[PDB]
Amino acid sequence: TPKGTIYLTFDDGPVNASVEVIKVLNQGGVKATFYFNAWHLDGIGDENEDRALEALKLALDSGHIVGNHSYDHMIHNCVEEFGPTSGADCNATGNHQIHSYQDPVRDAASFEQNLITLEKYLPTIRSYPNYKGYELARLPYTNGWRVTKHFQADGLCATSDNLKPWEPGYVCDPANPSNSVKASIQVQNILANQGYQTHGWDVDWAPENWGIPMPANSLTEAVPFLAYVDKALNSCSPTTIEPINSKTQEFPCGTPLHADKVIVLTHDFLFEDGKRGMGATQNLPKLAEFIRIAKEAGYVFDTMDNYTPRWSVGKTYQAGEYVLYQGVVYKAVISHTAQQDWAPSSTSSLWTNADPATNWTLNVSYEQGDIVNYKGKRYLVSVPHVSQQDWTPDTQNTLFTAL
């Protein structure tokens, strides 16, 4: 058995720098997950991105998983009016993490616009099974999780209503989060109701020193970075990670789905020779070496579509274990061996639906105190039970209490 599983996740592509990243992954014999912002395809993301479409194609042809990071990384919330210069304008002020989320309905819509743009520039994109843009997402700035009904948590100081975390007098209060944070929580919930899973991260491969003129040069070297990964293995990193805005304060430490796994966050743009330093020259070798030594150390690499393991026939499942099947999360009812014809579903006796959603749904095991939406109204679950078609909340005033 492997020491553990590493999930390499790259955010904020597709950009020019993405091309050589992908080749290093391919040479290293691994697959990774890229959470993309399609505004780079429109040439308005203020990066070197004329090869953005080439990069998207290469990632997909190479078998890497493509997930959804929103169309514009929420830069519409950093400027007065969104347009071709907004990316540059927001870099001018450095106000990315201030008022990052405002109208959650509009902000969640940015993930659907991302799908439109990706499918505009690459009209064949849905013929790739590794296109997961409509299944897997990650919120900008936010170490937030919607994995299963019992595995979800928010980044409670991810974004701010005024001061940045390093500025003097900055105050983070998880118990009374910022308006931006509250908005981001609603965004998570909207996406979950559209069938997305969202995942945060355990470790962030970033500059060790942002105060030099080429901060990318300071990216952690492979050996010490592997030490960070070893340290994160089974140690609830999302609660102890720094800085404070990268935390998931109420991450469910010890949750079985998270055991023996480390999600690495990094950014394509840290591997470019450019305005952040000699990223290609200094850091592509670090990536190559990290992959080699991680494997030597006993790790294997996987992608986020398998973070929740796919249901597989012949496997013996235990009561309470989670699988993913056709994009939906299910939880085993009893110990059994999966047969071909016994796949999880909305009518299975062997599984219940355990998507991290809040709209009332068939064959879900509801707990007391859960709140579900049904036909535009909210309902408290008063009697815990497994939902069925004839027990809709509008007809069941003992099991549910209207709010």
Query: In this structure, which amino acid lies at residue 157?
Result: C
289 binds a second copy (CB under 8 A): no
Rounded CA gap, 28 and 284, in Å?
A: 11
Helix, strand, coil % over all residues of the chain, rounded to 5: 30, 20, 50
54 binds a second copy (CB under 8 A): no
Among 26, 48, 95, 194, binds a second copy (CB under 8 A): 194
Tell me which residues touch Zn ion (CB under 5 A): 11-12, 140
The answer to whether 271 touches 20, Cβ cutoff 8 Å, is: yes
* Count of chain residues binding a second copy (CB under 8 A): 43
Q: With CB cut-offs between 5 and 8 Å by kind, which of a second copy, Zn ion, Ca ion, none does residue 350 bind? A: a second copy
195 binds Ca ion (CB under 5 A): yes
Rounded CA gap, 47 and 275, in Å?
A: 9
Shortest separation between residue 95's beta carbon and a second copy, angstroms? 25
Shortest separation between residue 180's beta carbon and a second copy, angstroms? 19
Shortest separation between residue 70's beta carbon and Zn ion, angstroms? 8
Site string for a second copy, 120-149 (x = CB under 8 A): x-xxxxxxxx--------------------
CA dihedral 100→105→110→112, nearest 10 degrees, is: 150
The answer to whether 136 touches 304, Cβ cutoff 8 Å, is: yes
Q: Which stretch binds Ca ion (CB under 5 A): 77-85, 193-201, 235-243, 337-345?
A: 193-201
Shortest separation between residue 327's beta carbon and Ca ion, angstroms? 4
94 binds Ca ion (CB under 5 A): no
Rounded CA gap, 280 and 168, in Å?
A: 34
For the chain, report the end-to-end CA distance as a whole number of angstroms: 49
240 binds a second copy (CB under 8 A): no
Q: Which stretch binds a second copy (CB under 8 A): 31-39, 117-125, 145-153, 157-165?
A: 117-125
56 binds a second copy (CB under 8 A): no
Residue with tokens 């989060």: 177
Among 22, 39, 49, 57, binds a second copy (CB under 8 A): 57
Rounded CA gap, 195 and 115, in Å?
A: 14
Q: With CB cut-offs between 5 and 8 Å by kind, which of Zn ion, Ca ion, a second copy, none does residue 168 bind? A: none
Among 169, 211, 254, 376, binds a second copy (CB under 8 A): 376
Rounded CA gap, 307 and 7, in Å?
A: 8
Shortest separation between residue 56's beta carbon and Ca ion, angstroms? 22
Specify the residue, 12 or 302, whose C-beta has the smaller distance to Zn ion: 12
Rounded CA gap, 201 and 247, in Å?
A: 9
Specify the residue, 300 or 313, whose C-beta has the smaller distance to a second copy: 313
Neighbours of 385 (CB within 10 A): 17
Q: Which stretch binds Ca ion (CB under 5 A): 55-63, 109-117, 192-200, 387-395?
A: 192-200
Question: Which residues are CB-contacts of 347 (< 8 A; sequence separation ≥ 6)?
Answer: 362, 363
149 three-class SS: coil
Specify the residue, 106 or 231, whose C-beta has the smaller distance to a second copy: 106
**Phi and psi for 151 in degrees, rounded to 5?**
-140, 90
Rounded CA gap, 379 and 399, in Å?
A: 10
Specify the residue, 2 or 195, whose C-beta has the smaller distance to Ca ion: 195
Long-range contacts of the stretch 79-85 (C-beta < 8 A, 24+): 83/44, 84/44, 85/44
Which residue from 311, 307, 323, 329 is spatially nearest to 5, judged by alpha carbons?
307
Site string for a second copy, 323-342 (x = CB under 8 A): --xx-------------xxx
169 binds a second copy (CB under 8 A): no
Where does this chain bind a second copy (CB under 8 A)? 57, 60-61, 105-106, 109, 112-113, 115-116, 119-120, 122-129, 190, 193-194, 313, 325-326, 340-343, 345-350, 359-360, 373-377
